[PDB]
């Protein structure tokens, strides 16, 4: 029976010590300050960070001039630079270890909407994402964890169908208009 063969895995991990004031309030800091749906999203971010830091740690373990070191060091660095998650003049493969979950949370599309305006709130940013109000190049995106690359960051803009930036007015508009008319 094929389609048994389609792989799939887990994306987060529940924390080791469930009830800690320090971690609990730090995670509430982050979840409220980025307006997230729950702490699953945050835990995905530590999982991705854990993955990349394991890779970077293993790369730093080796020595330079080692072709394995150079190759996926450069691959990891160009991945980071495509996500703009490192700044210019900062490609050293240690500033990958330096970065923290705030960096990933800052690239999510909600945050980018908030920082480009067009939301008037970060929770308003999330909802605008999920009501098909925003495209990237031409395709309307509704996943608030979209992880925009800088080559797409410049022209993140409304859809051509959303009432705010595109075409016809919404259903509340048209009910009010038709009962006025």
């Amino acid at each position: 029976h094929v389609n048994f063969y389609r792989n799939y895995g887990k994306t987060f991990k529940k924390p080791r010590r469930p009830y800690e004031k320090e971690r609990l309030d730090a995670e509430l800091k982050l979840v409220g300050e980025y307006g997230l749906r729950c702490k699953r999203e945050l835990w995905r971010v530590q999982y991705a960070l854990s993955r990349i830091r394991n890779a970077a740690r293993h790369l730093l373990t080796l020595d330079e001039k080692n072709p394995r070191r150079i190759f996926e060091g450069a691959a990891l660095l160009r991945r980071m630079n495509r996500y703009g998650l490192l700044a210019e003049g900062q490609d050293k493969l240690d500033y990958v270890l330096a970065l923290t979950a705030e960096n990933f949370l800052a690239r999510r599309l909600q945050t980018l909407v908030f920082k480009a305006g067009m939301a008037k709130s970060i929770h308003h940013a999330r909802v605008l994402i999920r009501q098909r109000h925003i495209r990237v190049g031409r395709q309307i995106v509704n996943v608030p964890s979209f992880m925009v690359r800088v080559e797409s960051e410049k022209h993140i803009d409304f859809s051509l169908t959303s009432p705010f930036g595109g075409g016809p007015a919404g259903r509340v508009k048209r009910k009010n208009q038709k009962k006025a008319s």
Binding site: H1, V2, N3, Y5, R6, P67, I70, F71, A74
Partner: protein, 261 residues
């Protein structure tokens, strides 16, 4: 089990067939033929997966039963035919010739050739020995048997065969310093010049080859294949002139192709 296995499952398929994983349960199961059937490509993989002239099993069946697809001088309507190394696949309606060679990363390309270097093929010999009534004959890794061999053509050597006279026209003596290209393992695809050959009693003979630009490697005898005498090949090499390039180098090629446009 209790007989020959007549189904082949896609994951069990050779890794150089490139074929995907959710594409189905089964793979073409290349029929018994003239080439080693783990080192081969079915003509269904030649048609549907590489050239895309069809889109289904049945459309490839239409292709082959039209009698167009002609291999090695004679049409082969089998849809699991084990076409392999320097088999020439011709199509009269497209007037288009192909020859099957390894590319440097261990897989099979269909290199176009014109008619003059499609009138003939080139293959290595397995062994030359006598037969009934003392008539000598030689055996090739393409399976072909040739009687009355030239008294100098010996084992492991290479021979050209036209498709009309259907016999030998010339032969490369497998020896030190002639260009080869490995046909199996991790070094397969890479052409190069034999630079040394050491023999150990009772085991595989080791062939040390040097590529056209400095790199050196080793290989077992069953995998190497002389092409031409000296450095010059007697066959049209693919877009990579048999040099396997390190991953860093191939990253630089794509970076340079990006920054050139």
């Amino acid at each position: 089990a209790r007989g020959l296995k007549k189904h082949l499952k896609r994951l069990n398929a050779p890794s150089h067939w490139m074929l995907d994983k959710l594409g189905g349960a089964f793979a073409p199961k290349p029929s018994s033929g003239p080439h080693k059937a783990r080192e081969c490509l079915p003509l269904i993989l030649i048609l549907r997966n590489r050239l895309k002239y069809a889109l289904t099993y049945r459309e490839v069946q239409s292709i082959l039963m039209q009698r167009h697809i002609m291999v090695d001088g004679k049409v082969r309507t089998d849809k699991t035919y084990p076409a392999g190394f320097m088999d020439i696949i011709s199509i009269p309606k497209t007037g288009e010739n192909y020859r099957l060679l390894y590319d440097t990363k261990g897989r099979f390309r269909l290199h176009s050739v014109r008619d003059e270097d499609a009138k003939f093929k080139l293959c290595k010999v397995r062994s030359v020995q006598f037969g009934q009534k003392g008539i000598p004959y030689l055996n090739t890794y393409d399976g072909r048997t040739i009687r009355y061999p030239d008294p100098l053509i010996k084992a492991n050597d290479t021979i050209k065969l036209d498709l009309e006279t259907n016999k030998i026209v010339d032969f490369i003596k497998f020896d030190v310093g002639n260009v080869v290209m490995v046909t199996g393992g991790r070094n397969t695809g890479r052409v190069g010049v034999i630079k040394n050959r050491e023999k150990h009693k009772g085991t595989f003979e080791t062939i040390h080859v040097e590529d056209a630009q400095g790199h050196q490697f080793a290989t077992r005898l069953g995998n190497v294949f002389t092409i031409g005498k000296g450095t010059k090949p007697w066959v049209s090499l693919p877009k990579g002139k048999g040099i396997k390039l390190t991953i860093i180098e191939e990253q630089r090629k794509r970076d340079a192709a990006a920054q050139a446009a």
